[PDB]
Amino acid sequence: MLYVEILGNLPEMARDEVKAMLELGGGEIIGQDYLFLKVDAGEKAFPFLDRLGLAHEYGLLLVEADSVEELLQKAGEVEWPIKGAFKVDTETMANCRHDVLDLPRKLGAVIHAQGFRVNLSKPDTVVRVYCGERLYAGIRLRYFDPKDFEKRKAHHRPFFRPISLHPRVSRALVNLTKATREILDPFMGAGGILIEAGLLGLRVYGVDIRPEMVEGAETNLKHYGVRDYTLKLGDATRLEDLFPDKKFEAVATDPPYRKRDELYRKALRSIYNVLEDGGRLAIAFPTDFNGKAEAEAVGFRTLGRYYQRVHKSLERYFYVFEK
Numbered sequence: 001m002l003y004v005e006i007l008g009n010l011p012e013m014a015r016d017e018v019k020a021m022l023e024l025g026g027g028e029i030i031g032q033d034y035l036f037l038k039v040d041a042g043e044k045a046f047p048f049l050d051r052l053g054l055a056h057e058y059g060l061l062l063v064e065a066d067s068v069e070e071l072l073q074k075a076g077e078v079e080w081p082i083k084g085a086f087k088v089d090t091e092t093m094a095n096c097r098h099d100v101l102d103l104p105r106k107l108g109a110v111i112h113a114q115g116f117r118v119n120l121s122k123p124d125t126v127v128r129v130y131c132g133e134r135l136y137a138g139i140r141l142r143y144f145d146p147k148d149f150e151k152r153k154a155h156h157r158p159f160f161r162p163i164s165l166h167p168r169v170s171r172a173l174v175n176l177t178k179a180t181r182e183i184l185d186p187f188m189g190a191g192g193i194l195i196e197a198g199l200l201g202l203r204v205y206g207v208d209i210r211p212e213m214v215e216g217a218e219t220n221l222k223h224y225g226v227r228d229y230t231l232k233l234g235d236a237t238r239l240e241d242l243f244p245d246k247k248f249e250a251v252a253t254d255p256p257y258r259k260r261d262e263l264y265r266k267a268l269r270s271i272y273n274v275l276e277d278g279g280r281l282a283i284a285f286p287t288d289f290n291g292k293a294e295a296e297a298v299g300f301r302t303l304g305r306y307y308q309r310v311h312k313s314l315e316r317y318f319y320v321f322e323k
């Protein structure tokens with residue numbers, strides 16, 4: 001059993017991102033306690049969970065209990081896979097219903113008795129306790145540091161344009177398509193989505209109608225050590241002609257906000273036509289465009305729609321569509 005802690009700002013999107021990665025990894029979510037997900041999966045899922053953009057961490061889930069007394073009792077009956085020295089670190093969620101004061105000391109004593117030493121300042125293994133409606137104990141396998149994503153915001157890129165999604169959301173869009181080989185962004189701009197895809201080890205394709213963006217995205221992709229790219233100057237409504245004998249595994253994009261609606265309709269048709277059967281499109285549209293109806297009109301099935309206000313006079317949805 002595993003656990004994943006998700007970010008709370010876009011919690012349905014975050015849960016669906018985990019669902020998508022678990023589907024690749026042969027597992028599924030079996031419970032949720034606030035922003036703690038109980039996960040039925042194994043090591044096969046680790047490389048996919050490693051991809052997450054809207055999660056705080058994941059790890060092994062070793063104990064679930066309905067009281068501290070029960071938590072400590074079960075923790076004694078578990079073989080703890082501790083590497084090196086450990087420490088206990090509790091995460092008190094907003095819905096915590098338990099007194100966990102001094103729990104790190106108590107659980108620490110239980111685990112220490114199994115022949116493991118405690119290092120409070122530099123642990124090799126972090127034992128985690130989550131407190132929500134229930135108590136959960138396990139071992140953290142990966143922490144996703146928010147800092148790593150903040151460091152890839154637009155003003156840190158050699159080609160700076162303040163026109164990208166948050167890197168975490170760019171990453172989540174890529175993952176919601178479940179791409180494992182490649183992805184296309186036909187409105188690529190400064191390359192924010194393709195940067196995340198490339199960092200995930202995917203082959204990337206990009207289009208932009210502006211030469212400066214084609215040049216700039218390449219500058220940024222090189223900056224992040226992405227090598228497996230194909231960038232083209234051209235029109236997202238003509239992907240069939242741009243990539244004549246190609247069906248893409250996945251598409252993720254944030255289009256400009258021709259008349260707007262006509263561009264969107266034509267781009268949806270063009271993208272549909274170059275997607276593999278079973279392929280997915282992750283895409284944002286401002287809320288005043290009927291994205292669901294228009295995409296379904298061209299043949300897409302809608303898998304997800306997630307609302308986000310951008311600023312005081314702009315709202316959008318993130319969509320996940322399936323051909």
Ligand SMILES: C[S@@+](CC[C@H](N)C(=O)[O-])C[C@H]1O[C@@H](n2cnc3c(N)ncnc32)[C@H](O)[C@@H]1O
Pocket residue numbers: 163164165170185186187188189190191192193194207208209210213234235236237252253254255256257
């Ligand atoms: C706001 S940027 C979004 C970039 C990208 N999806 C991302 O990660 O944010 C939108 C880009 O679409 C480009 N664009 C506008 N019309 C286009 C078209 N018909 N075909 C391809 N690109 C287009 C613009 O030049 C701009 O760089």
